[PDB]
Design an enzyme around this catalytic site. Structure first.
Site, PDB file in Angstrom:
ATOM      1  CD  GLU A 103      46.534  46.263  42.685  1.00  0.00           C
ATOM      2  OE1 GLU A 103      45.866  45.664  43.551  1.00  0.00           O
ATOM      3  OE2 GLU A 103      46.250  47.396  42.252  1.00  0.00           O
ATOM      4  CG  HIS A 116      43.799  40.941  44.122  1.00  0.00           C
ATOM      5  ND1 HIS A 116      43.832  42.317  44.059  1.00  0.00           N
ATOM      6  CD2 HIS A 116      45.080  40.543  44.304  1.00  0.00           C
ATOM      7  CE1 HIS A 116      45.078  42.733  44.195  1.00  0.00           C
ATOM      8  NE2 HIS A 116      45.855  41.676  44.347  1.00  0.00           N
ATOM      9  CB  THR A 195      44.915  47.510  45.827  1.00  0.00           C
ATOM     10  OG1 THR A 195      44.114  46.815  44.861  1.00  0.00           O
ATOM     11  CG2 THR A 195      45.626  46.509  46.743  1.00  0.00           C
ATOM     12  CB  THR A 196      40.331  49.543  43.903  1.00  0.00           C
ATOM     13  OG1 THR A 196      39.446  48.671  44.617  1.00  0.00           O
ATOM     14  CG2 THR A 196      41.194  48.724  42.963  1.00  0.00           C
TER      15      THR A 196
HETATM   16  C1  LIG Z   1      31.188  42.841  47.043  1.00  0.00           C
HETATM   17  C2  LIG Z   1      32.034  43.801  46.216  1.00  0.00           C
HETATM   18  C3  LIG Z   1      31.858  43.442  44.735  1.00  0.00           C
HETATM   19  O1  LIG Z   1      33.443  43.514  46.567  1.00  0.00           O
HETATM   20  B1  LIG Z   1      34.077  44.715  46.712  1.00  0.00           B
HETATM   21  C4  LIG Z   1      35.590  44.927  46.426  1.00  0.00           C
HETATM   22  C5  LIG Z   1      36.048  46.191  46.024  1.00  0.00           C
HETATM   23  C6  LIG Z   1      37.410  46.404  45.737  1.00  0.00           C
HETATM   24  C7  LIG Z   1      38.337  45.337  45.852  1.00  0.00           C
HETATM   25  N1  LIG Z   1      39.709  45.608  45.524  1.00  0.00           N
HETATM   26  S1  LIG Z   1      41.058  44.742  45.887  1.00  0.00           S
HETATM   27  N2  LIG Z   1      42.097  45.051  44.741  1.00  0.00           N
HETATM   28  O2  LIG Z   1      41.558  45.285  47.115  1.00  0.00           O
HETATM   29  O3  LIG Z   1      40.734  43.345  45.871  1.00  0.00           O
HETATM   30  C8  LIG Z   1      37.881  44.053  46.267  1.00  0.00           C
HETATM   31  C9  LIG Z   1      36.507  43.859  46.552  1.00  0.00           C
HETATM   32  O4  LIG Z   1      33.229  45.720  47.090  1.00  0.00           O
HETATM   33  C10 LIG Z   1      31.882  45.375  46.591  1.00  0.00           C
HETATM   34  C11 LIG Z   1      31.586  46.323  45.427  1.00  0.00           C
HETATM   35  C12 LIG Z   1      30.899  45.706  47.716  1.00  0.00           C
HETATM   36 ZN   LIG Z   2      42.431  43.648  43.347  1.00  0.00          ZN
END
Ligand SMILES: CC1(C)OB(c2ccc(NS(N)(=O)=O)cc2)OC1(C)C
Ligand SMILES: [Zn+2]
Length: 257
Positions: A103, A116, A195-196
Protein backbone atom coordinates in the site's frame (compact mmCIF):
# COMPACT_ATOMS: atom_id res chain seq x y z
CA UNK A 1 -20.26 -3.48 -0.48
CA UNK A 2 -16.79 -2.01 -0.93
CA UNK A 3 -13.99 -4.14 -2.31
CA UNK A 4 -11.06 -4.01 -4.71
CA UNK A 5 -12.85 -4.76 -7.96
CA UNK A 6 -13.53 -2.50 -10.93
CA UNK A 7 -16.98 -1.56 -9.65
CA UNK A 8 -16.41 -1.41 -5.89
CA UNK A 9 -12.70 -0.62 -5.67
CA UNK A 10 -10.69 2.28 -4.12
CA UNK A 11 -11.93 4.85 -6.65
CA UNK A 12 -15.51 4.13 -5.51
CA UNK A 13 -15.03 4.24 -1.73
CA UNK A 14 -15.50 8.01 -1.41
CA UNK A 15 -19.21 7.66 -2.20
CA UNK A 16 -20.02 5.71 0.97
CA UNK A 17 -16.97 7.01 2.84
CA UNK A 18 -16.47 10.74 2.05
CA UNK A 19 -13.38 10.90 4.26
CA UNK A 20 -11.68 8.98 1.43
CA UNK A 21 -10.77 12.41 0.02
CA UNK A 22 -9.79 13.72 3.45
CA UNK A 23 -6.69 15.58 4.62
CA UNK A 24 -4.73 12.69 6.16
CA UNK A 25 -5.50 9.59 4.12
CA UNK A 26 -3.29 6.53 3.79
CA UNK A 27 -1.33 5.01 2.29
CA UNK A 28 1.14 7.51 0.81
CA UNK A 29 4.29 7.39 -1.26
CA UNK A 30 7.38 7.78 0.90
CA UNK A 31 9.82 10.17 -0.78
CA UNK A 32 13.02 9.18 1.02
CA UNK A 33 14.84 12.36 0.05
CA UNK A 34 12.07 14.62 1.32
CA UNK A 35 11.61 12.68 4.57
CA UNK A 36 13.50 14.48 7.34
CA UNK A 37 15.39 12.88 10.22
CA UNK A 38 13.66 13.78 13.47
CA UNK A 39 15.81 13.89 16.63
CA UNK A 40 12.66 14.43 18.71
CA UNK A 41 11.80 10.76 18.15
CA UNK A 42 12.45 8.43 21.07
CA UNK A 43 13.65 4.85 20.55
CA UNK A 44 10.90 2.62 19.13
CA UNK A 45 9.88 -0.20 21.47
CA UNK A 46 8.22 -3.37 20.16
CA UNK A 47 7.49 -5.78 23.03
CA UNK A 48 5.72 -8.85 21.67
CA UNK A 49 7.16 -11.41 24.10
CA UNK A 50 3.81 -11.97 25.84
CA UNK A 51 1.62 -11.72 22.72
CA UNK A 52 -1.31 -14.15 22.74
CA UNK A 53 -2.92 -14.84 19.36
CA UNK A 54 -6.44 -16.27 19.35
CA UNK A 55 -7.48 -17.09 15.81
CA UNK A 56 -7.26 -16.29 12.12
CA UNK A 57 -10.15 -15.00 10.02
CA UNK A 58 -10.87 -14.43 6.33
CA UNK A 59 -13.02 -11.29 6.33
CA UNK A 60 -13.47 -11.12 2.57
CA UNK A 61 -10.83 -8.39 2.20
CA UNK A 62 -7.78 -10.01 3.80
CA UNK A 63 -7.09 -12.42 6.66
CA UNK A 64 -6.70 -11.27 10.25
CA UNK A 65 -4.64 -12.94 12.95
CA UNK A 66 -6.42 -11.64 16.07
CA UNK A 67 -4.90 -11.29 19.53
CA UNK A 68 -6.17 -11.20 23.10
CA UNK A 69 -5.83 -7.54 24.10
CA UNK A 70 -7.71 -7.70 27.42
CA UNK A 71 -4.37 -7.48 29.24
CA UNK A 72 -1.20 -5.44 29.01
CA UNK A 73 0.75 -7.64 26.58
CA UNK A 74 2.20 -7.12 23.10
CA UNK A 75 2.76 -3.37 23.18
CA UNK A 76 4.25 -0.74 20.91
CA UNK A 77 5.54 2.53 22.32
CA UNK A 78 8.32 5.07 21.98
CA UNK A 79 9.21 6.59 18.64
CA UNK A 80 6.55 9.21 17.73
CA UNK A 81 4.08 7.62 20.14
CA UNK A 82 2.92 9.02 23.45
CA UNK A 83 1.87 6.32 25.86
CA UNK A 84 1.25 2.63 25.21
CA UNK A 85 -0.48 1.06 22.21
CA UNK A 86 -1.74 -2.52 22.43
CA UNK A 87 -1.59 -5.09 19.60
CA UNK A 88 -5.04 -6.26 18.51
CA UNK A 89 -4.47 -7.87 15.10
CA UNK A 90 -2.27 -8.07 12.02
CA UNK A 91 -3.00 -8.73 8.35
CA UNK A 92 -1.42 -8.23 4.95
CA UNK A 93 -2.10 -6.58 1.61
CA UNK A 94 -0.65 -8.29 -1.47
CA UNK A 95 -0.74 -8.37 -5.25
CA UNK A 96 -1.54 -10.74 -8.08
CA UNK A 97 2.12 -10.46 -9.11
CA UNK A 98 5.40 -9.91 -7.23
CA UNK A 99 5.78 -6.45 -8.77
CA UNK A 100 2.86 -5.00 -6.80
CA UNK A 101 0.95 -5.47 -3.57
CA UNK A 102 2.15 -2.96 -0.99
CA UNK A 103 0.00 0.00 0.00
CA UNK A 104 2.77 2.40 0.97
CA UNK A 105 5.47 2.88 -1.64
CA UNK A 106 9.09 4.03 -1.30
CA UNK A 107 10.14 6.49 -3.99
CA UNK A 108 7.24 5.01 -5.96
CA UNK A 109 8.56 1.45 -5.56
CA UNK A 110 5.83 -1.10 -4.86
CA UNK A 111 6.78 -4.14 -2.77
CA UNK A 112 5.21 -7.59 -3.20
CA UNK A 113 3.17 -7.14 -0.02
CA UNK A 114 2.79 -5.21 3.22
CA UNK A 115 2.16 -6.40 6.78
CA UNK A 116 0.05 -4.28 9.12
CA UNK A 117 0.34 -4.78 12.89
CA UNK A 118 -2.56 -2.83 14.42
CA UNK A 119 -2.39 -1.31 17.92
CA UNK A 120 -4.79 0.90 19.87
CA UNK A 121 -3.90 3.64 22.37
CA UNK A 122 -4.60 2.21 25.84
CA UNK A 123 -5.57 5.65 27.16
CA UNK A 124 -8.88 5.12 25.34
CA UNK A 125 -10.00 1.90 27.02
CA UNK A 126 -10.60 -0.16 23.88
CA UNK A 127 -10.35 -0.24 20.10
CA UNK A 128 -13.87 1.09 19.65
CA UNK A 129 -13.15 4.29 21.57
CA UNK A 130 -9.68 4.60 20.06
CA UNK A 131 -10.93 4.93 16.49
CA UNK A 132 -12.83 8.07 17.49
CA UNK A 133 -9.57 9.81 18.39
CA UNK A 134 -6.88 11.47 16.17
CA UNK A 135 -4.19 9.43 17.94
CA UNK A 136 -6.22 6.32 18.73
CA UNK A 137 -4.24 3.88 16.58
CA UNK A 138 -0.66 3.03 15.65
CA UNK A 139 -0.05 0.67 12.76
CA UNK A 140 3.40 -0.81 12.26
CA UNK A 141 3.86 -1.42 8.55
CA UNK A 142 6.41 -3.86 7.19
CA UNK A 143 7.19 -4.45 3.52
CA UNK A 144 7.54 -7.94 2.07
CA UNK A 145 9.78 -8.75 -0.90
CA UNK A 146 10.08 -12.11 -2.64
CA UNK A 147 13.29 -14.03 -2.01
CA UNK A 148 14.21 -16.30 0.88
CA UNK A 149 11.38 -17.80 2.92
CA UNK A 150 10.43 -16.24 6.26
CA UNK A 151 10.43 -19.18 8.72
CA UNK A 152 8.16 -17.35 11.14
CA UNK A 153 5.45 -16.84 8.51
CA UNK A 154 4.99 -20.50 7.57
CA UNK A 155 2.53 -21.28 10.38
CA UNK A 156 0.30 -18.55 8.96
CA UNK A 157 0.77 -19.85 5.42
CA UNK A 158 -0.21 -23.40 6.37
CA UNK A 159 -3.51 -22.50 8.04
CA UNK A 160 -4.76 -20.49 5.05
CA UNK A 161 -6.14 -23.62 3.41
CA UNK A 162 -8.67 -23.83 6.26
CA UNK A 163 -10.01 -20.28 5.81
CA UNK A 164 -10.09 -20.10 2.02
CA UNK A 165 -13.38 -18.20 1.79
CA UNK A 166 -15.01 -15.14 3.34
CA UNK A 167 -16.35 -15.72 6.83
CA UNK A 168 -14.22 -18.74 7.68
CA UNK A 169 -11.99 -18.69 10.76
CA UNK A 170 -9.73 -21.10 12.61
CA UNK A 171 -8.08 -21.34 16.01
CA UNK A 172 -4.63 -19.79 15.83
CA UNK A 173 -3.03 -19.74 19.25
CA UNK A 174 0.60 -19.36 20.28
CA UNK A 175 1.70 -17.54 17.13
CA UNK A 176 4.70 -15.29 17.82
CA UNK A 177 4.62 -12.08 15.74
CA UNK A 178 8.28 -11.43 16.54
CA UNK A 179 9.00 -13.90 13.75
CA UNK A 180 7.69 -11.40 11.19
CA UNK A 181 10.01 -8.52 12.14
CA UNK A 182 13.07 -7.45 10.13
CA UNK A 183 16.46 -6.85 11.76
CA UNK A 184 16.44 -3.05 11.90
CA UNK A 185 13.65 -0.92 13.36
CA UNK A 186 14.62 2.12 11.25
CA UNK A 187 11.32 3.69 10.21
CA UNK A 188 9.40 6.56 8.63
CA UNK A 189 6.36 8.00 10.41
CA UNK A 190 3.43 10.26 9.56
CA UNK A 191 -0.20 10.88 10.59
CA UNK A 192 -2.65 8.95 8.45
CA UNK A 193 -5.73 6.74 8.37
CA UNK A 194 -7.03 3.22 8.00
CA UNK A 195 -6.39 2.18 4.38
CA UNK A 196 -9.69 0.31 4.21
CA UNK A 197 -13.22 1.62 4.75
CA UNK A 198 -14.22 3.31 7.05
CA UNK A 199 -10.82 4.95 6.38
CA UNK A 200 -10.83 6.64 9.80
CA UNK A 201 -8.11 9.21 10.34
CA UNK A 202 -6.91 7.98 13.73
CA UNK A 203 -3.61 6.40 12.75
CA UNK A 204 0.02 7.19 13.47
CA UNK A 205 1.84 5.17 10.83
CA UNK A 206 5.22 3.66 11.55
CA UNK A 207 6.63 2.07 8.38
CA UNK A 208 9.87 0.12 8.69
CA UNK A 209 12.56 0.80 6.10
CA UNK A 210 13.91 -2.76 6.02
CA UNK A 211 11.57 -5.24 4.34
CA UNK A 212 11.34 -8.90 5.27
CA UNK A 213 11.91 -11.58 2.66
CA UNK A 214 9.28 -14.23 1.98
CA UNK A 215 9.44 -17.03 -0.59
CA UNK A 216 7.54 -17.10 -3.85
CA UNK A 217 5.84 -20.22 -2.50
CA UNK A 218 4.63 -18.42 0.63
CA UNK A 219 3.10 -15.45 -1.20
CA UNK A 220 1.65 -17.80 -3.81
CA UNK A 221 -0.45 -19.39 -1.08
CA UNK A 222 -1.71 -15.93 -0.04
CA UNK A 223 -3.04 -15.68 -3.60
CA UNK A 224 -5.03 -18.91 -3.26
CA UNK A 225 -7.42 -17.29 -0.79
CA UNK A 226 -10.86 -16.11 -1.94
CA UNK A 227 -12.68 -12.77 -1.60
CA UNK A 228 -15.96 -14.64 -2.01
CA UNK A 229 -17.79 -16.78 0.50
CA UNK A 230 -18.19 -20.54 0.14
CA UNK A 231 -20.49 -21.69 -2.65
CA UNK A 232 -19.91 -18.50 -4.65
CA UNK A 233 -18.04 -17.83 -7.93
CA UNK A 234 -14.33 -17.90 -7.09
CA UNK A 235 -12.58 -14.54 -7.03
CA UNK A 236 -8.97 -14.92 -5.94
CA UNK A 237 -7.95 -12.68 -3.06
CA UNK A 238 -5.25 -10.66 -4.82
CA UNK A 239 -4.45 -6.97 -5.19
CA UNK A 240 -6.27 -6.06 -1.99
CA UNK A 241 -4.28 -2.84 -1.66
CA UNK A 242 -5.24 0.83 -1.81
CA UNK A 243 -2.97 3.03 -3.96
CA UNK A 244 -0.98 6.00 -2.66
CA UNK A 245 -3.05 9.00 -1.60
CA UNK A 246 -2.26 12.77 -1.61
CA UNK A 247 0.22 13.80 1.09
CA UNK A 248 -1.29 17.29 1.36
CA UNK A 249 0.11 19.07 4.42
CA UNK A 250 1.96 16.33 6.18
CA UNK A 251 5.66 15.70 6.55
CA UNK A 252 7.16 12.23 6.75
CA UNK A 253 9.73 11.98 9.54
CA UNK A 254 12.63 9.53 9.56
CA UNK A 255 14.02 7.87 12.67
CA UNK A 256 17.46 7.51 11.07
CA UNK A 257 20.35 9.16 9.21
C1 LIG B 1 -10.70 -4.52 15.90
C2 LIG B 1 -10.88 -4.54 14.38
C3 LIG B 1 -10.75 -5.99 13.91
O1 LIG B 1 -9.72 -3.80 13.83
B1 LIG B 1 -10.19 -2.99 12.84
C4 LIG B 1 -9.35 -2.57 11.60
C5 LIG B 1 -10.00 -2.27 10.39
C6 LIG B 1 -9.26 -1.91 9.25
C7 LIG B 1 -7.85 -1.84 9.31
N1 LIG B 1 -7.14 -1.48 8.11
S1 LIG B 1 -5.59 -0.97 7.92
N2 LIG B 1 -5.16 -1.42 6.47
O2 LIG B 1 -5.65 0.46 7.95
O3 LIG B 1 -4.76 -1.62 8.89
C8 LIG B 1 -7.18 -2.13 10.53
C9 LIG B 1 -7.94 -2.49 11.67
O4 LIG B 1 -11.50 -2.63 13.02
C10 LIG B 1 -12.15 -3.71 13.81
C11 LIG B 1 -13.07 -4.46 12.85
C12 LIG B 1 -13.03 -3.01 14.85
ZN1 LIG C 1 -3.91 -2.98 6.30
Amino acid sequence: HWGYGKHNGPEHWHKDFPIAKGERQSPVDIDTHTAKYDPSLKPLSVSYDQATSLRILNNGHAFNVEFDDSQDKAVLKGGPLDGTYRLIQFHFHWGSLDGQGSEHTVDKKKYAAELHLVHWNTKYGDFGKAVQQPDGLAVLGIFLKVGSAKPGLQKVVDVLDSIKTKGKSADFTNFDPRGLLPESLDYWTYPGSLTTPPLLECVTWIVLKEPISVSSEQVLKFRKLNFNGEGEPEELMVDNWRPAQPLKNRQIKASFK
